[PDB]
Every structure is written in structure tokens, then in C-alpha cells.
Amino acid sequence: PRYLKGWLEDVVQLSLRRPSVRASRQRPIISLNERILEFNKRNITAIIALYMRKSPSGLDVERDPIEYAKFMERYAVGLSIVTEEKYFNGSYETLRKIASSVSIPILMNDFIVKESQIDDAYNLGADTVALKVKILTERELESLLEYARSYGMEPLIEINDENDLDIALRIGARFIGIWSETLEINKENQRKLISMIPSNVVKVAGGGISERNEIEELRKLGVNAFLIGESLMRNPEKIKELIE
Template identity: 35%
Template structure:
């Protein structure tokens, strides 16, 4: 955690440390590693699915299973993660993002495991990963990829966590918001970078953030636009700015007909 980490993130990270300590007591790291060795299936290729969709001309959407957030409270009252995951798959999502933070985002690690059993799409564990234990935890629970947030971690941690994820055959979506964080992402060698258009210090969303940082992407990298995407027009503008995939949560979760909204965004 850096000195300029936003207060909301500091609060989340401080609680996350106690949560991880409790998880270690319940399931020691050695047991997690044994579970991983016993897994019968391999990760499904999160980044590969995004790249294949983008190359084919399909709008690559990472649709998010998300009940709420600290800034917005409960976003969807009738929240059924399995039903939502199924709707996403049936209506053209390329991959899914599953919130597993329980305290602040009303998610749960078990959602990941349950969704893994019910859909064939690759899954991102979206959480605040600050410890190697969580990366093993993600693999054991059925994740195909993890989110690393640059504003939560030092460069050495980003490099180490990225390397560990790759050892476990997990893809990494590395989230940035400004030029300094994009430089950090480039130093890790991560090929899948998410630009969060929402400023976590002010919660102001500016879709122009994606375009501003797109020029810093290394050759061959895939840029994922995150936050503030509400309509097809947004996707077209972000595509023109350099985005190759789109992580969308709140604008889907607020719709009564999630499938219809997803089809509109994809333009399917």
C-alpha cells in the first residue's frame, strides 16, 4: 500500500488483512496448495477468450456479478449470482467478473466456486489482493484470472503476484488509473491492463481516462476499459480510444432485464 493510497482503499485493505488471517486459520496455505494439486480441470483462458473475441470483431465484455459497493450501497436487491451468471452467458458475455469481497461489496468466495460449476465462461476473481494466500485461494476456488490493483500494491508486489499467478496458470488483469500506475503495469510485463475510469479518491468517473492512458500500452497488450460504461455509444468511443475489452457491472446490475441490456451494449 502506497502513501497516496485513497482512504477508502486503506480501510478496505486494513480489514482485508484481518480477513486473510482468519482464512489462514480456517484453511492453512498448505491445504490450499493441496487442493490446487487435486483440481481436475485447467483454467479456461481468460485473456485468450478476450483476445479471440476482439480479433473476431465481437465486443468483448467482462460482465460483472456484483450486488453492491461502498459508494453506491446495494445495487441489485434481487441478487442471485448463479441466475445472473447464466443470463450473462446466454446473452453474449465473453468472460465474467465475480466480486468475492464480502464486507464492502457483498460478494463471497463461494460465488466463484458455484458459478464455475454452472457456466463455461472464464472467471475473474475481483477482490483486493494483497497477499499471496489470496492468489492460491482464487485458483482453488475456480478462478481463471485475478485482479491486481496498482493503487493497492508496491511495484515489487505487483511483479511477485503476477509471477505467482502465472505459475498457477492464472491470467492477471492489472488495474491502473493514472500514468504512474500504467508505468508500474508496464514494468511487470502484464499483457492485460484495465484502466479504471473512476478516480478512487473522488469517485468521479471520466471515460477520457482510457484514451489518455491507451497510448502507454506496450505493443501486443490488451487494454480493458473499466467503470462508467452505460451504453453502446460509450463502447464505440472507448474502442476508438484504444480499448479492446470492457468490464461492465453497475449499468447491467441496475437493469430489470439484464440480458437485453447486455445485448444492447454488445450490439448483438
Template identity: 30%
Template sequence: MILDELVTATHNRLERQREKVSLPKLKQEVAKLNATAKLDFLAVLQRPGIHVIAEVKKASPSKGTIVTDFPYLQVARTYEQAGADAISVLTEPDYFKGKLRYLNEISAATSIPTLRKDFTIDPYMVYEAKLNGAAIILLIVAILTDEQLCNLRKLAESLGMQAIVEAYTETEVTRAVRSGAKIIGINNRNLKNFAVDFGHSFKMRSLVPAKIPVIAESGISGPADVKRLAQADFKGVLVGEALMKATNKREMIRAFKEF
């Protein structure tokens, strides 16, 4: 399964990175950071309307290279100028061609929250996210135990970040709620085979208590999809491929924000 391969690659990457920078050293670097943080993303989601997480994404396992021209800083600035509420940055290098450097530079160049989009499996990656400017991390229920979900979320919060806890199945959504997640993402993409079903998130929405903001992820292609999600009480959408391929990214984001 693709997900198993991604997790294995992440473990291997972690081992290589620990040889370069130890966890104690990483913690020291994080401790030196200026205490000033970007706007709390949970507070953003509590505002009226639907909120857009616009993704900077070069490739994926299912689509291969999405764009050959990749001016990531320009794209990120365009997203912010168009009214995006946060920017998702792929940092997984083996399958998504992401880099931590992209996150670092985009976080420095923009004023809205940035999300480290990766397969976070260890506290080391949470500290990496913080050091490189992230205000949000992604925690995928399918690859974490209940203890890990809780501990990694609490660590992120202790560092001034928020966690989007991502689920796909009914069991995963239930686990996300039980873990104490403050933000839940429902993925329309099955990470075991990368098949996408836009209607999937609607089926899962009722499993999440109304007090927890829910974000729909994957398979969102245009304003009509966002309108349906807004009507179903989703508080946010994470859009990657459609925005990366859009000839007018500003116009697309502004159309999303009308609902």
C-alpha cells in the same frame, strides 16, 4: 481515503482467514485441483471484436446497495447465455457485500472465465482465487509495490490464471507496463474518492503498447460507450452497475458485442 480503508479491511480479513486455514494448507488444497482449466482469458482477448466482462455486483462504497434482489447464479448464467466473455465476481465483503462463495458457485455453474474482483495484496488471496474457481485475478497498481505486482502476476500465471493489472494515473499505467503486465485495465474511477470520468480511459490508452490488450473499467453505461472504446482499440470492457440494473441483461450484452 476510501482506498486506504479498503486495504486495511483486507489486511484484517486476511489475518482472520489465515487463522482458519493456513497458507500451507491452502496450497495443499489447490494442488489437489483438477488440472483442467477454463479457456485462457488472454487468448480470449486476442480474438477479433470487443470482449465483455460482465460483473455480478450487489453493492459498492459509492452507491451503497445497487440491487436488493440478488440471484447471483441466475445473473451469471444470463451473462454467459448472452455471450459475455468473462464474469467478474465481487468477493470483498465489508464494502461491496461480496463473498468467496459467490465466486465458487458461479465458477462451477458457468464455463467462461471468472474474475475474482477484490483488493489482492498477498499470495494467500491468489491461492484462494484459484481454489474457488477463478481464471483471472485483479491487481491494483495503487495498492501494490512493483515487486508485488510482478510476483503476484507470476504466481497467478503459474497456477494457470491471468491477471488484469489495473491502473488509473499516468504513473500507474507506466508501472503496469513496466511490471510485465499481459493485460492492463484502465479504470475510469478514481479509487481515492470514487469519482468517475468516462473520458479518462481514452487519455491513458496511448501509454500502453499496442501488443498489450487494454480493458476499460467503470462508468460504461451503454452500447454507445462501448462503440467509442472499440474504436479507440480497447479490447474489452468491464461493466457492473449498468448490467446489474438493466431490465434486459441479455439485450444489453448482445448490443455491446456488436462492435
């Protein structure tokens, strides 16, 4: 990993020692980036609903993950399940139960630093994974990207600054997420990063979306899909208004 100090270093050291799983996924991959493009083609707002048991930086919203996932199956383009175990109180088993309970694409949202975590995501039923540029060197990123692709997964490459975006574009990312959810989002940085991405890359924006107008303005800048957590975590049926 990159030079890291503090909380990210602790998360990365934990990830390096995370036990790999022995399980077999029972269904093929349902492509998240391809589904987003199909929603775009049909003028259907594409929202990836985020699920996390604990919000380290916000208030926790405790709710049943299965109840949440089955309801989202009807509306979301996909689900993003936070599996980081110590600070987000995630669980590979939660990911597995959700992936075997619904038929929409599932993204495993964690801090990936070793190939076996991609193996874990795949074996548990996830359809893709997020790769965070901020904890990886350029060479690690290119290697993990190819490793994910060898399973048939186009990972979501997460960036929050221009330096990381350049790295993502240089290694050939085709699915990019832009974000650093109750606090104030730096809209200028987000719009700047979006403007630097080629139109053929599927772009996902996240931040504090809670209103249809916010989504409409981002759509006008070319954003393909939206990652929404807190607002849906609190009131899941708000997604009906957001895609109306």
C-alpha cells in the same frame, strides 16, 4: 502494501487476515485474456460482466448471482465477481458456485495483497484475478504477477493513473484494466491512459458504460474489452444490445 490510510488500509488489513480455503478446482483454467483476443478476431464485442452484491458507492442491486451468471454465459466474454467480504458483501462461496455453474472465464475481483488469495481464487475456480497497483509496491506487484502466472493465470493489472501505468508496463503486464458507474467518468484521463499502452497489451476499459456508442468510440481507440457493472446488474439483457 503501499502507504495506505483510511478505507483502503482497512480493506488491506482485512485481506491480510482473510482465511485461505481448502478446495480443489475441478477444471483447468479458461484464459480470459486469450478469449478476449478470440472475440476481437471474430469482431465480437467482448464484455466482462461485473457482479457485486453490494455497491458501497452506489445503490445496491440485489439479484441472484447464479441466475445472472447463467444468463451471461451466452453473451459475455467473461465474468468479474467481487469477492471483498466486508464492504462489497462478497463471498468466496459465491465465486465457487458461479465458477462451477458456468463455462466462461471468471475473474476474481478483490484486493489481493498475499499469495494465499491467489491460491483461494485458483482453488475456488476462478480463471484469473485482478491485481490493483494502487495498494501494492512495485516489488509486490511483480511477485504476485509471477505467482499468478505460475498457476497459468494472466492477471488483470488495474490502473487509474499514469504513475501506476508506468509501474505496470515496467513489470511486464500483458493484461491491463483502466478505470477508477452512475457518476461522471473522466474520459480524458481514460483515453490518455489507453494511448500510453502498447498495442500488444490486452486492454480493458470500465466506467459508466451503458451505450453501444460509448463502446464503439473506445473500440476505435484500441480497447479490447469492456468491464460493465451497474447497467447490466440492473438490466442484464442490455448486453444483447451492446454486442449487437
